[PDB]
Design an enzyme around this catalytic site. Structure first.
Site, PDB file in Angstrom:
ATOM      1  N   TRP A   1       0.893  -1.178   0.000  1.00  0.00           N
ATOM      2  CA  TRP A   1       0.000   0.000   0.000  1.00  0.00           C
ATOM      3  C   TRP A   1       0.916   1.208   0.000  1.00  0.00           C
ATOM      4  CZ3 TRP A   1      -1.927   2.017   5.199  1.00  0.00           C
ATOM      5  CH2 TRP A   1      -2.869   3.021   5.047  1.00  0.00           C
TER       6      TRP A   1
ATOM      7  N   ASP B   1      -0.127  -5.954   9.466  1.00  0.00           N
ATOM      8  CA  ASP B   1      -1.116  -4.934   9.083  1.00  0.00           C
ATOM      9  C   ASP B   1      -2.401  -5.742   8.794  1.00  0.00           C
ATOM     10  OD1 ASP B   1      -2.777  -2.973   8.281  1.00  0.00           O
ATOM     11  OD2 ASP B   1      -1.438  -2.107   6.783  1.00  0.00           O
TER      12      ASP B   1
ATOM     13  N   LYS C   1     -13.260  -1.087   7.279  1.00  0.00           N
ATOM     14  CA  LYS C   1     -13.855  -1.969   6.295  1.00  0.00           C
ATOM     15  C   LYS C   1     -14.765  -3.039   6.845  1.00  0.00           C
ATOM     16  CE  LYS C   1      -9.739  -0.123   4.662  1.00  0.00           C
ATOM     17  NZ  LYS C   1      -8.309  -0.358   4.887  1.00  0.00           N
TER      18      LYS C   1
END
Ligand code: PLP
Ligand code: PLP
Lengths: 401, 401
Positions: free
Chosen positions: A133, A214, A250
């Site tokens: 990312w 993560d 999310k």
């Protein structure tokens, strides 16, 4: 004055540019595949029902707005640790962990980065997968660490360069920091299979590396919270004391409310408290204490059996829609007479998909079909609906034929 | 493994230390004057009516939870700048300012500190008043700046050491940074009077220093939003392009919601866009985007005439109660036959009052009167109610007679 005359215009954000450019489009056909959040089958933002229920419960109580402790809402951090580690996890049960509320997943990663900069005396190097990312870079660099990389994605097969990964990790200097995406790798969608994960654990253990996970998509990836956290739990069980960042952005659709947590696995409860004291010292001068809204919502859901139960159904529902879109894109590309191998689309997991399309192709797609995505061939599956999957397959076929 | 064995337990917070002792105490006459938040006449947390109303409004609208832009809610940032600068402010009308949402006042202060570290090429020195809010130190220090001080408080008179302040400021090397409390100085409650502010502005202008204003009590200090921002406004009018941190934690009782803003006064609108770009680049890797709840609430209030009017009445009520308490304390002291001069109590402004009591007197108050405060003789006026101001007057007399 003239304090800022030398301050230059910063680089424009690409993601931003596709959405903006998407907006100025007149095609009713047009599609936005650069969207970083979940969208329903109608292309609309989705607020979970369990989320609306928690908010009505909070509202009913007429709660105060008094500052939370620096470390955050205790019901929240505890539940967060529980969700991650697992209910009967030894790490959990012994209290040899420390969890502090962070500003979603990003704030949590930064707090962690800052903590490592301060206390991780063994090294300054952080190894990110190739690629990772975009935010990962500045997070660590800004924190004062050095960035390194290990091979991950194989552009030849649009899958994992397992061999490359194993060779690179094997060569990482002992006691270096390694960043791992727990599931639903961003931006590729390529994740190690359980068996490759066991092998990765072994090398990480051997090289005595500090594994930083993560975990932004627990439950949202496969529809199963336990399966999504498998890898994380495996490392811990193998005796690797990790550091971890969790996001509720999310999985609970908490996006703008910013609920997340940073956890450190310690040797014992005694060490956890020392570590905790230092995390508090670090956070104070950052933002004092964390935002209460998202934490309150998340805490209610996780801690109330009935809501937790409805939550699991809803997350599965989101994970399922994505999986369905992947499946439908592949079948529809085949039906179109496409001769290329598109199995990677279905092998990939989560919100992001590395299509393997080349830039000139992406361009044709935007120009002639009104399909907006980044030039790296990355598409957000959230942008695909049952109503337009057909159209996308056709366009892709047209541009790749 | 043993990654954290060298991590030492951090020092304990004296303030927290005061609250814990308070909590243990069984004397129903106990007073907590170590409390950093507003309390009503009943000693309870207070959620404003306009806040409850704005919240209901949000719920009614069934808003989504989508990510806010990096810089925050546009309606919130504009309204925040308007509040600080004044509607008819030249700086405001010309749009030569840049305002970004921050994690309350603290986050905003830190964002600003990080911005200075990065772009303020002229110096690394930040001059704070003696004394200043404790958090000011590590905020600037963690950001990578050097700390300096200027005389501010005069222990002789429990008032402003104007002579000392002017002398120190006159010796600050040109283009250094100076931190100023807009109003309601923390922790002494000693603020410069209008005439003093005019002299200070003249010197800051002349020595061409960058003025960093910390405005955490606008409206809360005197009950008048215009009067509270008088000094900040004066500096800008004099051609001093300041930097400023705003908090809605107190004025709106938003505490835990974390609503605040960071503003940079620029040469023009063009320069502001450039600075804004750089601020976004810095923020992303810190926490990505700001918490939405507090901003939504604050924007609704400021932007809805009916709610705004109501807020002004309520903030005035808060300030009035505090002034009333200072007033009552002074008259009760005379009433007890206190020969001493307690005028500073009424000359002081905001939540904090430096009483001038010595450490041994503070101890007696705690030990004998169950009145909890810090040894610096600092009292939180929020802890005083109509029902106990008499007792406090009493106890103070006893210990100073
Ligand atoms: C989304 C995400 C995060 C967390 O995002 P927040 O909105 O800050 O919670 C962290 N890492 C990756 C790789 C993500 O995709
Ligand atoms: C309260 C306060 C701030 C801001 O506090 P937040 O809760 O972070 O908004 C900043 N400066 C001073 C001097 C304060 O008293």
């Amino acid at each position: 004055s003239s304090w800022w005359s030398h301050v230059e215009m910063g680089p424009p954000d690409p993601i931003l540019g596709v959405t903006e450019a998407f907006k100025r489009d007149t095609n009713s056909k047009k599609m936005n595949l650069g969207v970083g959040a979940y969208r329903d089958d109608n292309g609309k933002p989705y607020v979970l029902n369990c989320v609306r229920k928690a908010e009505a419960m909070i509202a009913a109580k007429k709660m105060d707005k008094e500052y939370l402790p620096i470390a955050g809402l205790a019901d929240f951090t505890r539940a967060s640790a529980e969700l991650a580690l697992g209910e009967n996890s030894e790490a959990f049960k012994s209290g040899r962990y420390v969890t502090v509320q962070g500003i979603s997943g990003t704030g949590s990663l930064r707090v962690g980065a800052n903590f490592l900069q301060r206390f991780f005396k063994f090294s300054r190097d952080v190894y990110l997968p190739k690629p990772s990312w975009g935010n990962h870079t500045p997070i660590f660099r800004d924190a004062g660490l050095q960035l390194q990389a290990y091979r991950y994605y194989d552009p030849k097969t649009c899958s994992l360069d397992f061999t490359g990964a194993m060779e690179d990790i094997s060569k990482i200097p002992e006691k270096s920091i390694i960043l791992l995406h727990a599931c639903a790798h961003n931006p590729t969608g390529v994740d190690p299979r359980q068996e490759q994960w066991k092998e990765l654990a072994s090398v990480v253990k051997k090289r005595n590396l500090l594994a930083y996970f993560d975990m932004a998509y627990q439950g949202f990836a496969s529809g199963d919270i336990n399966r999504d956290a498998w890898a994380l739990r495996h490392f811990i069980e193998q005796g690797i004391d990790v550091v971890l960042s969790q996001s509720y952005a999310k999985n609970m659709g908490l996006y703008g409310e910013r609920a997340g947590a940073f956890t450190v696995i310690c040797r014992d409860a005694e060490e956890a408290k020392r570590v905790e004291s230092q995390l508090k010292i670090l956070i104070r001068p950052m933002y004092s204490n964390p935002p209460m809204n998202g934490a309150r919502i998340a805490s209610l859901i996780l801690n109330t059996p009935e809501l937790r139960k409805e939550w699991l159904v809803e997350v599965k529902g989101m994970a399922d829609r994505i999986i369905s879109m992947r499946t439908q894109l592949v079948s529809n590309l085949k039906k179109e007479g496409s001769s290329h191998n598109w199995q990677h689309i279905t092998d990939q997991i989560g919100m992001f998909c590395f299509t393997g399309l080349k830039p000139e192709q992406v361009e044709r797609l935007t120009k002639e079909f009104s399909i907006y995505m980044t030039k790296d061939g990355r598409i957000s599956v959230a942008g695909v609906a049952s109503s337009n999957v057909g159209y996308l397959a056709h366009a892709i076929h047209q541009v790749t034929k």
